[PDB]
Every structure is written in C-alpha cells, then in structure tokens.
Design a protein around this ligand. Sequence first.
Ligand SMILES: *[C@@H]1O[C@H](CO)[C@@H](O[C@@H]2O[C@H](CO)[C@@H](O[C@@H]3O[C@H](CO[C@H]4O[C@H](CO[C@H]5O[C@H](CO)[C@@H](O)[C@H](O)[C@@H]5O)[C@@H](O)[C@H](O[C@H]5O[C@H](CO)[C@@H](O)[C@H](O)[C@@H]5O)[C@@H]4O)[C@@H](O)[C@H](O[C@H]4O[C@H](CO[C@H]5O[C@H](CO)[C@@H](O)[C@H](O)[C@@H]5O)[C@@H](O)[C@H](O)[C@@H]4O[C@H]4O[C@H](CO)[C@@H](O)[C@H](O)[C@@H]4O)[C@@H]3O)[C@H](O)[C@H]2NC(C)=O)[C@H](O)[C@H]1NC(C)=O
Ligand code: HEM
Ligand SMILES: *[C@@H]1O[C@H](CO)[C@@H](O[C@@H]2O[C@H](CO)[C@@H](O[C@@H]3O[C@H](CO)[C@@H](O)[C@H](O)[C@@H]3O)[C@H](O)[C@H]2NC(C)=O)[C@H](O)[C@H]1NC(C)=O
Ligand SMILES: *[C@@H]1O[C@H](CO)[C@@H](O[C@@H]2O[C@H](CO)[C@@H](O)[C@H](O)[C@H]2NC(C)=O)[C@H](O)[C@H]1NC(C)=O
Ligand SMILES: *[C@@H]1O[C@H](CO)[C@@H](O)[C@H](O)[C@H]1NC(C)=O
Ligand SMILES: [Cl-]
Ligand SMILES: [Mg+2]
Length: 324
Amino acid sequence: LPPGPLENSSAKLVNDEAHPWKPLRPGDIRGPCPGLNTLASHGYLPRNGVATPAQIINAVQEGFNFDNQAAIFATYAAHLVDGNLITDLLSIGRKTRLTGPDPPPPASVGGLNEHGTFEGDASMTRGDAFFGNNHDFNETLFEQLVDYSNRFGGGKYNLTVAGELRFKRIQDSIATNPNFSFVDFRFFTAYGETTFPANLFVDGRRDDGQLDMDAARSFFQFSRMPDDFFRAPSPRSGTGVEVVVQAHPMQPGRNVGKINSYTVDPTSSDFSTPCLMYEKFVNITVKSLYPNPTVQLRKALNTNLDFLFQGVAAGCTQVFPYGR
Ligand SMILES: *[C@@H]1O[C@H](CO)[C@@H](O[C@@H]2O[C@H](CO)[C@@H](O[C@@H]3O[C@H](CO[C@H]4O[C@H](CO[C@H]5O[C@H](CO)[C@@H](O)[C@H](O)[C@@H]5O)[C@@H](O)[C@H](O[C@H]5O[C@H](CO)[C@@H](O)[C@H](O)[C@@H]5O)[C@@H]4O)[C@@H](O)[C@H](O[C@H]4O[C@H](CO[C@H]5O[C@H](CO)[C@@H](O)[C@H](O)[C@@H]5O)[C@@H](O)[C@H](O)[C@@H]4O[C@H]4O[C@H](CO)[C@@H](O)[C@H](O)[C@@H]4O)[C@@H]3O)[C@H](O)[C@H]2NC(C)=O)[C@H](O)[C@H]1NC(C)=O
Ligand code: HEM
Ligand SMILES: *[C@@H]1O[C@H](CO)[C@@H](O[C@@H]2O[C@H](CO)[C@@H](O[C@@H]3O[C@H](CO)[C@@H](O)[C@H](O)[C@@H]3O)[C@H](O)[C@H]2NC(C)=O)[C@H](O)[C@H]1NC(C)=O
Ligand SMILES: *[C@@H]1O[C@H](CO)[C@@H](O[C@@H]2O[C@H](CO)[C@@H](O)[C@H](O)[C@H]2NC(C)=O)[C@H](O)[C@H]1NC(C)=O
Ligand SMILES: *[C@@H]1O[C@H](CO)[C@@H](O)[C@H](O)[C@H]1NC(C)=O
Ligand SMILES: [Cl-]
Ligand SMILES: [Mg+2]
C-alpha cells in the first residue's frame, strides 16, 4: 500500500489546468519542506496541508519525479515520528487537531514542524528551532542562498553552491545555536536536501542542474511552480549528495550547551554507515516516541516500519524495535 514507481516517468508539464497555484485559505498548513508545500499549493497534495503517506508518495512522484525508494524512506520516516499512526494522517507543518486525537505521551504527533524528529538545524531557508521559528521562509537566509549562487554558481544554484552553502549554515549554527545538533538522521537529510533544488526544481526540458533565482524564490518562498514548469525527465532524489558531503567534510556532532562547542559524536552514523542511520532511526528515535505501545499502536508501528524498510539502502537488514 506504499505506491509503486510511476508507470510513465517522462518529463511533462506539471503546472497544468488540473494543478493551478492558489493562495492560502484560513487554516491551510505549510511547513519546512518547500517540495511538499508546493505540491499542496498546486493541489497535488490536499491544499489544507494534511495528507496520508500514500498521498505524499503519489504527489512527490507525480509532481516532481521524486524516486520511489527515496519517497518511501522519507514519507514513512516522517509519518512514524510526526504523523498519527491510527488515522494515517500527517501535517506537512504545525501540529493540528485535524490529524486526530493527541496521542498519549511521549508520542508528539507534531507534524513536520516538530523539531528533532525529522526537521532539524542548518536548513538553507528556515531558521533553527532554538531561535523560535523552524518553518517559515527567512529572507536573510534566502539572500545568502542568492549570494552563494552568485559567488559559486554564476548566479544559479548548483551542486557547487550546495557544497559551500551547506558548510556556511553548519558554521552559522555552531557559532550561534547552543543546542545545535548534527548527528544521525539530520546529518543525512541536511546534505541530501541541498541537492533537491538542482535535481528537482530545474525544469525537466533542461535538467542541467542549474537553478535560476526566480524559480528558487517561487518554490522556497511562495510554494509555486514556475509558469509552464515541467517536472524532471526521470525519477531522482539526492543525486550528487557525495559532492556536497566532500566539499567541506564534517564529522557528525553537536554543540554541548554553549556556542562554538561542536563535539564529535562517535556513536553517530555518517555517509559510510547508512544501515546504522536506519537502525538508530527505528531503534532509538521511533522507539523513544513509542517505548511500550498498546496492541493497536504496535500493529500500526510494525506496518509503517515494514513500509519504511522498503525504502532503505540496498543491503541493510531489517531492524525490529517491537520484535516479530
Ligand atoms: C532493536 O531494538 C530491540 C529492542 O526494542 C532489540 O530487541 C531486543 O534485544 C534484546 C537483546 O537481545 C532482548 O533482550 C533479551 O531478552 C531475552 C528474553 O527476555 C525475556 O525472557 C527472559 C528469560 O525468561 C525465561 O526464564 C525465566 C526465569 O529466569 C522465566 O520466568 C520465563 O518464563 C522464561 O522461561 C526473562 O528473564 C526476561 O525478563 C526480564 O525482562 C522483562 C521485560 O523487560 C522484565 O519484565 C523482567 O522482570 C526481567 O527484567 C524476559 O521476560 C533475555 O533472556 C536476554 O537476557 C540476557 O541478556 C541480558 C543482556 O545481556 C547483555 O547486556 C548486559 C548489560 O545490560 C551485560 O551484563 C551482559 O554481559 C550482556 O552484554 C542479560 O542481562 C541477561 O542476564 C541475559 O544474559 C544471558 O544470556 C545472554 C545471551 O543473550 C548472555 O550474554 C549472558 O552471558 C547470559 O547467559 C535479553 O534481555 C529483547 O528481548 C529484544 N526485544 C525484542 C522486542 O525483540 C533489537 O536487538 C535491536 N536491534 C538491533 C539490531 O540493535
Ligand atoms: C518524500 C516526502 C518528503 C518529506 C516527508 C519531506 C520532508 C521534509 C522536511 C521535514 C524538511 C525539513 C528539514 C529541515 O530543513 O529542517 C524538508 C526539507 C526540504 N525538502 Fe522535503 N520532504 C519530502 C520530499 C521533498 C521533495 C519531493 C522535494 C523537492 C521537490 C523536497 C525538497 C526539500 C528541500 C529543498 C528542503 C530543504 C529546505 C531548506 O533547507 O530550506 N522535499 N523536507
Ligand atoms: C532569519 O535568519 C537570520 C539569519 O540566521 C536571523 O538573523 C539573526 O537574528 C538575530 C536577532 O533575532 C541577530 O542577533 C543579534 O545579533 C546582534 C549583533 O551581533 C546582537 O546585538 C543582538 O544581541 C542579537 O543577538 C543576529 O545578528 C542575526 N544574524 C544574521 C546573520 O543576521 C533571523 O533572526 C531569522 N529570522 C528572521 C525573522 O529574519
Ligand atoms: C556551478 O556553477 C559554476 C559557474 O557556472 C560552474 O563552474 C563553471 O563551470 C563551467 C563548466 O560548464 C566552466 O566553463 C567554468 O570554467 C566554471 N566557472 C567557474 C566560475 O568556476 C560549476 O561547474 C557549476 N557546478 C555544477 C555541478 O554544475
Ligand atoms: C508518457 O508520458 C508522455 C507525456 O509527457 C507521453 O507523450 C507518452 O505517450 C506517455 N507514454 C505512454 C505509453 O502513454
Ligand atoms: Cl523510482
Ligand atoms: Mg530545519
């Protein structure tokens, strides 16, 4: 019941008659992900910003040609930590009554806005949770993306710009955020996310990895596809992530309660240990939210954990927080 890959994955107009941009209505939810935000604001996703895992996987495939394996891993990771496992509903932003009754602690069901579950620090266009707003578009951070595009990309965002801006944001957070955390799941997502604008926001007829700043603003700020936008011509997600990782090689770590105190975490996964990243996500992060689930919640957890495993890096063994 995770959707499979697109039967037809060719480039096509996705800013079409059936999927017009509309402004936000009172109550509509938007969050820290410009990709899901754009799909909601073009009605690929429900325009209110509440969705099921299957709607999200269909929408990122249909609207952007996100690859099926990456869609499955990201969607079921997010739903396991931020979504209501009983109703099968996830907010793409703030915590809402609309996803169902607030679960017994320590589960949070906080939507994609929930800090430290999926969302984390050193986002390109969003502030760190520590500073009080982890989801709204930040013009100072966007201006920095434009500046790094001018410096390293001839005015366009590309994998070279991604490498420099990723490092600058890490350095920004080490210097200013006493609770800065850059380990395990966020260490992985923080690098992959910087490739998405080059791989997925670039018009599919061109697919040259060079994103112009008008398109960049339209997606990041307004959740809006360019006029006549064509999706990528094949499924992809994090192509070129190794280029960004190696631009300024980092060890995973955290500040220890003061600025400029970045301490390497030797227990953290990194890009050499993708199976450990999956193992710690399920056996520490998911387990911490659902330490002794009821019979009903245990069944929903195991179903969604089976789905998550379908998205894992080839070669990893399934991990069972609740046995089999
Ligand atoms: C992802 O996460 C999941 C967790 O979410 C991981 O899955 C878990 O993995 C752990 C580790 O394998 C499992 O823990 C093991 O559980 C078994 C079974 O426990 C149950 O059965 C025993 C025995 O019951 C029988 O006998 C009694 C009488 O004695 C009867 O009354 C019964 O009816 C049975 O016939 C019970 O004693 C257990 O009760 C305890 O636990 C329950 C529930 O918590 C309590 O309510 C009880 O009151 C009681 O406290 C239970 O019912 C168990 O036998 C294993 O114990 C052995 O290993 C532990 C840990 O040993 C290591 O760690 C310590 C440091 O903590 C260190 O000192 C040691 O040297 C080892 O490094 C020992 O403490 C025990 O003494 C015992 O040791 C013996 O056997 C081991 C070999 O395994 C050997 O090392 C020793 O030398 C010694 O001979 C153990 O606790 C979980 O069950 C499992 N959970 C699930 C859901 O599957 C998953 O691994 C992870 N994945 C990854 C990839 O990381
Ligand atoms: C598959 C389902 C997806 C989920 C669950 C998801 C979830 C998230 C979340 C929670 C964040 C916030 C992380 C952070 O920066 O703190 C994020 C960031 C991001 N996502 Fe998504 N996402 C998905 C798919 C996509 C797609 C398809 C795109 C591109 C079309 C995309 C582009 C981005 C970008 C660019 C960021 C970084 C924003 C920034 O740092 O300024 N995502 N995603
Ligand atoms: C958007 O993101 C930007 C960039 O990360 C945030 O900018 C930071 O905002 C804080 C204040 O809220 C500034 O802190 C101040 O620094 C001065 C001078 O060093 C000091 O006198 C004050 O005590 C205060 O701490 C900080 O300088 C600033 N950083 C940058 C690069 O501009 C911003 O808050 C985010 N949100 C919004 C709504 O823009
Ligand atoms: C990011 O943009 C910069 C600037 O366009 C690229 O560096 C240029 O690459 C072209 C190759 O087609 C060369 O003709 C120039 O010599 C380079 N100019 C500068 C200023 O370095 C870089 O290749 C781009 N990165 C990616 C991954 O596409
Ligand atoms: C796949 O999609 C494109 C739409 O851009 C279309 O031209 C092509 O015919 C489609 N293939 C099939 C078998 O329908
Ligand atoms: Cl695919
Ligand atoms: Mg963030």
